[PDB]
Structures are given as structure tokens and as C-alpha cells.
């Protein structure tokens, strides 16, 4: 009853710090059956282990980088900066998104597909190379559409966030994309994105 | 009527502008009231 | 392959620096940002003639904080006014964090450099910029292939690029590994300096206004009493000087009080009598 007790005190130190938020350049896709996500220009598949399809079906979807243009040809890719350019890629369709999720600057290259043939050449993982392909870039309805023939149709649409940059004339840019270095399991990949414009 | 119709048009235009003003206010209030309270 | 010289400088105008400081403080504790306009005069010069702020966004300071509509319209209407300068670079404020570039800062700077190889990313600490020193730096980048190959980021041809030493705080946050500091020089012509001089240019009047004579007498009384105590201390200390071989000074304080007394009273006398004889 006659307790009347004193009291001690044990403090707990507390502190933390938000680091420099790290940009993860990750692409996601569910083209045929697998929710594959890859980090990356060295390529490494995060989830969606050894792909049921070949890598090439998705190698064409890979801001911050743009093709090399001469001084004669207006470089819509370049002057669209600092914001960059958002494109719609039709193969299966591909779109690039910039989001702020969590503490990672997400440069999504979100992939999606359908109409996978039961014996199509894209899933047996056979692959020789991608021969140099010329994209004819021209303006249809205020959107920079690039028509390219796939050799191993592409209906690329490029829109700048700065909707004031003048549209370049219809030219023919030669892309040469090939899977430089990889592994058999295709989990440690190095990609090539060389491409130069030609009038 | 005529001056009163002019007042009617004045007030409807100021409403038309103030609607988008409210929209902008809501936009920026969501911009600052984000989430991680 | 061409290499950026270490003698390259960023000539910030007076107006640009003032606008940058004002905007950086006005957003404390948030990090504000904006675009610096100017011109790349040559390979060794980047002139920042002006800088306009950008609306605050919940994103923070990122490549998504540059609203294309705002930037485009501001540039167009400034060009209408007479300022048709390209977007040289971008600036943002690190309040109390020192001057450096974080991962996202490096990211936005990569975005800007994609627009033009020469492009600076000056940052300003608005709360460390206490009167006197101004804490501000300007960094571009280092290409990863340049660094991994072992070649130095920037060719050197003079001592200009090394007159100032890098800070530890910047160095740990990636300085000389991913971005290099660019020397900053302030372009202040005579006209701007003379205009700024009016901030504390007293008047033509206070040169002729006498001190409140009662206040003057009270100040004289107080300082003379303090000087009396100091003289007592000085006498006491000097008496010790004799019985002490070479082995606060009541003298230095005494000299300071003497100087303040003579300046105050000489000024007051002269001002008073000039007043007596210029005003009838
Ligand atoms: Zn920053």
C-alpha cells in the first residue's frame, strides 16, 4: 500500500536518413505467359526466369538515350529533351512510362503481347541475328510515325513531352540492334543499340 | 432587362473562370497533400 | 577524342545569382529548381545570363519537375521581351545538404546533357549562404566509359581549374567520380555594382545629422568610465611589467576605446560646426 516508488529512465536513440533515391531502369511485360521484369546497357532479368520465348521478341524495347542524327536531319530525339520522348511500339505492343513509385525513379518500358502462335519462331528460342533495318520516319497526324520492316511491321509513334518541337521531314534511319553478349540461360545479357540517321 | 442580361452574362462568365480556378486549387492541394503523412 | 578543359568557367550574372538565392530561400525547407538561360560562348566558357524559377511540384527536383508547357511558354515570352537565350542548364537548392548531386540529381543532369553536351547543373545551399560566403557549386558529369578506361575526366592546360579545393562533403557524394566541379565566376559590370551600391548608400543627409546630443553625452560618459577602469587595469598590469623579464590586454582595449572616442567626438564636433556655418 505505502509503495511510493521512484522512477528511472532509459532513453532510446532514434534516427534515420533517406539516401539518394536510386533510379532502377526496369522493364516489365506479360507478352505470352510470364510477367517478366528485367533490370538494366547490361541486361539482367529480375523476375521471370529463363524465358519460354526468345529474347529477341522483346529486345527492340530498350529516354536518356537517342539515335545519332546528322546536322542536316532535325534531331527530334535530341531537342525533345530534357523531358524526353514517349513512344508507342507495335510489334504485341510496347510503351515507355516514367513513374515515381516508392523511392525509385521508374523508367518502365512496359511490354505486352497476345496472339502467340503455338509453334511460332519466337518461342523456340531460335535466333540468327537482326539484320540492319531502315525505319522511314514521317508525320501522319501530328505524330512522328516510324515505319520499319522487321528482319531477322513496326509502327513506332514518338511524342515529345515538349509539344512544341518541330517535326523532322520523312527520313530513313538505319538501326542495327544485335544481342552482343549473353548466357544460354539468358540472365546476364549485354545489348547493342547502335543506330544512325540517313537522309 | 438589357443591363440585367448584361449582369447575367458577366456573372456566368466569372463562374466559368472560377470553376477552372477551383480545379487548379484542387490540383495543387492534391500536389501538396500527397500521402505519406 | 575531345576532352573538356579544366579551365572552363561558368560566368553567372549578378541577376542570375540573386534570383537563384532568392528562389532557393523562398522554398526552404523544400528543394526548388529552375532553368538557367545563357549561352555557351566557347569550349571554355558557359555564360549564365539569367535564370527563371519553376513551379514547385510534389515530385521534388527531377526531370518530371520541368513542366514542358511552363518552360516553353516562359522561353517564348522572354524571347518576346528580348531575352532569347537558350536553356544553358538547370539549378536546384540543397538546403543544408551542401553542394553536390544525388543519384536523382545525376539523373536529371544526364537528361539535360542529352539535350546538349555542354550543360551545367549548378546547385545552391540557401541556408548555408549566410551573409558573406555563398555556398554554390556547378558540376557537369563524367561519362562512365571515360572513367572506366582510366583516362582523366578533364584535360588540364592551366592552373585555373585548381585554384579552389573540392569539399569533403561533395567528394563523398560522388565528386570527381561521376561529376566534376566547374569553377564559377561572377560577371559584375560597373553599372550593376553601382546599382547594388545603393542598398546601403546612406544618404546626403546622415552626413550632416548630429547625434542626439543627450545620447552623445551619455555614450561619452559610459565610454570614459570604461576607459577609466581600463586605465586602472593598465596601470596594474604595467606595474607587473617591471618585475617580469621577457616571459586580454588592458592596453589593447584601452586603445580601442580611445579610437572610438576620438572618432565619435571628432565627427560630432566637425558635423556640428559645419552645420552651424552652412545653415546660416
Ligand atoms: Zn538534389
UniProtKB/Swiss-Prot annotation, chain B:
Subcellular location: Cytoplasm; Nucleus
Family label: Belongs to the AAA ATPase family.
PTM characteristics: Sumoylated by UBE2I in response to MEKK1-mediated stimuli.
Protein name listed in UniProt: 26S proteasome regulatory subunit 6A
Portion of the full-length sequence here: 52 to 88 of 439
Associated clinical condition: Deafness, cataract, impaired intellectual development, and polyneuropathy: An autosomal recessive disease characterized by early onset of deafness, cataract, severe developmental delay, and severely impaired intellectual development. Patients later develop polyneuropathy of the lower extremities, associated with depigmentation of the hair in that area.
Source lineage: Eukaryota, Metazoa, Chordata, Craniata, Vertebrata
Assembly information from the UniProt record: Component of the 19S proteasome regulatory particle complex. The 26S proteasome consists of a 20S core particle (CP) and two 19S regulatory subunits (RP). The regulatory particle is made of a lid composed of 9 subunits, a base containing 6 ATPases including PSMC3 and few additional components. Interacts with PAAF1.
Main function: Component of the 26S proteasome, a multiprotein complex involved in the ATP-dependent degradation of ubiquitinated proteins. This complex plays a key role in the maintenance of protein homeostasis by removing misfolded or damaged proteins, which could impair cellular functions, and by removing proteins whose functions are no longer required. Therefore, the proteasome participates in numerous cellular processes, including cell cycle progression, apoptosis, or DNA damage repair.
Coiled-coil ranges from the UniProt annotation: none
Native source organism of the sequence: Homo sapiens (Human)
From Swiss-Prot, chain C:
SUPFAM superfamilies assigned to the protein according to its UniProt record, in alphabetical order: JAB1/MPN domain
Keyword annotations from UniProtKB, A to Z: DNA damage, DNA repair, Hydrolase, Metal-binding, Metalloprotease, Phosphoprotein, Protease, Proteasome, Ubl conjugation pathway, Zinc
Modified residues (Phosphoserine): 129, 203
UniProt xrefs under SMART domains: JAB_MPN (SM00232)
Tissue-specific expression: Widely expressed. Highest levels in heart and skeletal muscle.
An annotated GO BP: double-strand break repair via homologous recombination
Catalytic class of the enzyme: hydrolase
Positions bound to Zn(2+): 92, 94, 105
InterPro entries: JAMM/MPN+_dom, JAMM_MPN+_peptidase_M67A, MPN, RPN11_C
UniProt domain MPN: residue ranges: 10-145
Motif JAMM motif positions after renumbering to this chain: 92-105
Domain of life: Eukaryota
An example Gene Ontology molecular-function term: metal-dependent deubiquitinase activity
Entry EC number(s): 3.4.19.-
Subunit structure: Component of the 19S proteasome regulatory particle complex. The 26S proteasome consists of a 20S core particle (CP) and two 19S regulatory subunits (RP). The regulatory particle is made of a lid composed of 9 subunits including PSMD4, a base containing 6 ATPases and few additional components. Within the complex, PSMD4 interacts with subunit PSMD7 through their respective MPN domain. Interacts with TXNL1.
Function: Component of the 26S proteasome, a multiprotein complex involved in the ATP-dependent degradation of ubiquitinated proteins. This complex plays a key role in the maintenance of protein homeostasis by removing misfolded or damaged proteins, which could impair cellular functions, and by removing proteins whose functions are no longer required. Therefore, the proteasome participates in numerous cellular processes, including cell cycle progression, apoptosis, or DNA damage repair.
Name of the molecule in the record: 26S proteasome non-ATPase regulatory subunit 14
Organism: Homo sapiens (Human)
Gene: PSMD14
Amino acid at each position: 500500500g505505502n509503495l511510493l516508488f521512484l522512477a528511472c529512465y532509459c532513453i532510446g536513440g532514434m534516427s534515420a536518413i533517406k539516401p539518394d533515391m536510386k533510379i532502377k531502369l526496369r522493364m516489365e511485360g506479360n507478352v505470352n505467359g510470364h510477367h517478366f521484369v528485367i533490370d538494366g546497357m547490361d541486361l539482367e532479368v529480375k523476375e521471370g526466369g529463363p524465358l519460354p520465348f526468345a529474347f529477341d521478341i522483346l529486345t527492340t524495347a530498350f529516354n536518356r538515350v537517342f539515335a545519332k542524327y546528322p546536322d542536316n536531319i532535325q534531331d527530334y530525339f535530341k531537342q525533345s529533351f530534357p523531358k524526353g520522348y514517349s513512344w508507342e511500339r507495335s510489334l504485341c505492343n510496347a510503351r515507355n512510362d516514367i513513374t515515381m513509385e516508392g523511392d525509385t525513379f521508374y523508367n518502365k518500358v512496359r511490354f505486352y503481347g497476345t496472339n502467340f502462335p503455338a509453334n511460332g519462331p519466337v518461342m523456340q528460342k531460335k535466333t540468327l541475328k537482326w539484320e540492319p533495318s531502315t525505319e522511314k520516319m514521317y508525320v501522319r497526324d501530328g505524330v512522328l510515325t516510324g515505319d520499319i520492316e522487321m528482319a531477322l511491321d513496326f509502327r513506332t509513334t514518338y511524342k515529345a513531352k515538349e509539344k512544341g518541337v518541330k517535326l523532322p521531314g520523312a527520313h530513313f534511319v538505319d538501326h542495327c540492334i544485335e544481342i552482343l553478349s549473353h548466357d544460354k540461360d539468358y540472365n546476364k545479357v549485354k545489348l547493342y543499340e547502335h543506330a544512325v540517321a540517313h537522309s | 432587362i438589357k443591363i440585367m442580361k448584361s449582369e447575367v452574362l458577366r456573372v456566368t462568365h466569372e463562374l466559368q473562370a472560377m470553376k477552372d480556378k477551383i480545379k487548379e486549387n484542387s490540383e495543387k492541394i492534391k500536389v501538396n497533400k500527397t500521402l505519406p503523412y | 577524342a575531345p576532352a573538356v578543359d579544366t579551365a572552363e568557367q561558368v560566368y553567372i550574372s549578378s541577376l542570375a545569382l540573386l534570383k537563384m538565392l532568392k528562389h532557393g530561400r523562398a522554398g526552404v525547407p523544400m528543394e526548388v529548381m529552375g532553368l538557367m538561360l545563357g549561352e555557351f560562348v566557347d569550349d571554355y566558357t558557359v555564360r549564365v545570363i539569367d535564370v527563371f524559377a519553376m513551379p514547385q511540384s510534389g515530385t521534388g527536383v527531377s526531370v518530371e519537375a520541368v513542366d514542358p508547357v511552363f518552360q516553353a511558354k516562359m522561353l517564348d515570352m522572354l524571347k518576346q521581351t528580348g531575352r532569347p537565350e537558350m536553356v544553358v542548364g538547370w539549378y536546384h537548392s540543397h538546403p543544408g545538404f551542401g553542394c553536390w548531386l544525388s543519384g536523382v540529381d545525376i539523373n536529371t543532369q544526364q537528361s539535360f546533357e542529352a539535350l546538349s553536351e555542354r550543360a551545367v547543373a549548378v546547385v545552391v545551399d540557401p541556408i548555408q549562404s549566410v551573409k558573406g560566403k555563398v555556398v554554390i557549386d556547378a558540376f557537369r558529369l563524367i561519362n562512365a566509359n571515360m572513367m572506366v578506361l582510366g583516362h582523366e575526366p578533364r584535360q588540364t592546360t592551366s592552373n585555373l581549374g585548381h585554384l579552389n579545393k573540392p569539399s569533403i562533403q561533395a567528394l563523398i557524394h560522388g565528386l570527381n567520380r561521376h561529376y566534376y566541379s566547374i569553377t564559377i565566376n561572377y560577371r559584375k559590370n560597373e553599372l550593376e555594382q553601382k546599382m547594388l551600391l545603393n542598398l546601403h548608400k546612406k544618404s546626403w543627409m546622415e552626413g550632416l545629422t548630429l547625434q542626439d546630443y543627450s545620447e552623445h553625452c551619455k555614450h561619452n560618459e559610459s565610454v570614459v568610465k570604461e576607459m577609466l577602469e581600463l586605465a586602472k587595469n593598465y596601470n596594474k598590469a604595467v606595474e607587473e611589467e617591471d618585475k617580469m623579464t621577457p616571459e586580454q590586454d588592458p592596453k589593447r582595449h584601452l586603445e580601442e576605446h580611445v579610437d572610438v572616442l576620438m572618432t565619435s567626438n571628432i565627427v560630432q564636433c566637425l558635423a556640428a560646426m559645419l552645420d552651424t556655418v552652412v545653415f546660416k
